[PDB]
Amino acid sequence: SNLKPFERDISTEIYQAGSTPCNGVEGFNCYFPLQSYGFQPTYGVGYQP
C-alpha cells in the first residue's frame, strides 16, 4: 500500500503478487521490490540522473 508523507521505508522483504504465499527469496509472483536504474554518460535527457 502507498505510504504516508515522509514515511521512509527501508524493508527489502520479497513482495507477493499472487495467491500463493511468498516463500523463499524468489518465486512465482514473488519479486524483490527494489530495482536499479540505468545511468551512463551515453544517456540523454529524461534518463540522466
Add this chain to the structure above:
Amino acid sequence: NCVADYSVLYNSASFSTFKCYGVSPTKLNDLCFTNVYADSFVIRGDEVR
C-alpha cells in the same frame, strides 16, 4: 459484449510467462474496455523477447 474474468488466467500455474506494463495486471478486471484483440499464434521459445 461479455464479462472478462482475468483472475483465472492470472492465477493458474499452467503458463510460462505473463508480461505487460500497459496497466498493472492485478487491476485488469476492474477496468472496462471496448474491444479485445486476441492475437493467438505460435513462435519459438527464445523468440518471445
